[PDB]
């Protein structure tokens, strides 16, 4: 039964304290204006590295491999940025990081007001 | 908890039949034996500044507006006057008592000496340590890390 099945895979996680609202909000952010940081440094797109955290968060090749038999060439567009995004100093790598965890917190939020 | 810092360079007053003589004191390691309770003498005028350190004690010597002299009161050297109140020159600073150790939170680094008759200066570059506490709050997040060494005017939280 799919009904009581729902429920109970929403029921296994608890929910959420102002505290850990606050600071869900906050680093989702956080991460979201590295991406706006990063798009300044490279010199690409808002959306294209914010996809491709995804690409390396959200799964393996099992994200870009069925949006449909069309999105974005896995090995072409995605590959070449995300070793072009790899080699850069100790000043803009961080703001990686904050982004897969920015973006990764969005998720848990998700979750908890589900 | 953030533990601050905070330097100064002082002197000091206290016989030669007591000095136990160190470049360096740990925190309450024992300094100046002595014989009977030795008066702090001051060797200079001006008004006092008197800030209680734990055990020990510290006594800013300033005319007006700047510093004239800074005294450093081990444990259990007493102070004779209250902060603020205007002395003179030999005036009867503080009493020292038999063993006066180091403070318990304090170090001694690059010690000096100057030693006249049954009586010795020692000026001592005092460092320790005046923690504070801070109550953080859900409208806040810690930022630096766990016993992590902080700069002036740092953003902790």
Redesign the interface.
């Known amino acids: 039964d799919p009904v009581r099945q729902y429920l109970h895979e929403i029921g296994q996680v608890p929910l959420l304290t102002?505290?850990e609202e606050?600071?869900l909000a906050?680093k989702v952010e956080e991460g979201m204006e590295a991406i706006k940081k990063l798009s300044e440094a490279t010199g690409l797109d808002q959306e294209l590295i914010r996809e491709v955290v995804r690409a390396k968060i959200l799964g393996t090749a099992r994200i870009q491999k069925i949006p449909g038999l069309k999105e974005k060439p896995d090995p072409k567009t995605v590959e070449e940025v995300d070793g072009k995004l790899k080699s850069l100093p100790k000043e803009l790598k961080r703001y990686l990081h904050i982004a897969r965890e920015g973006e990764a917190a969005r998720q848990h939020l998700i979750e908890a007001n589900l | 908890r953030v533990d601050y810092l905070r330097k100064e360079r002082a002197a000091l007053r206290i016989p030669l039949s007591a000095w136990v003589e160190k470049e360096a004191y740990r925190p309450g390691e024992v300094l100046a034996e002595l014989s009977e309770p030795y008066l702090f003498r001051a060797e200079e005028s001006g008004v006092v500044e008197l800030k209680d350190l734990a055990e020990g004690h510290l006594i800013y010597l300033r005319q007006e507006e700047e510093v004239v002299a800074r005294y450093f009161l081990p444990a259990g050297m007493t102070p004779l006057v209250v902060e603020g109140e205007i002395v003179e020159v030999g005036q009867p600073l503080a009493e020292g008592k038999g063993l006066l150790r180091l403070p318990r939170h304090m170090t001694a680094k690059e010690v000096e000496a100057e030693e006249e008759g049954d009586s010795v200066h020692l000026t001592l570059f005092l460092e320790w340590t005046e923690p504070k506490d801070y109550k953080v709050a859900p409208h806040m997040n810690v930022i630096v890390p766990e016993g992590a060494k902080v700069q002036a005017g740092e953003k902790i939280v």
């Open positions: 102002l505290e606050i600071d906050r």
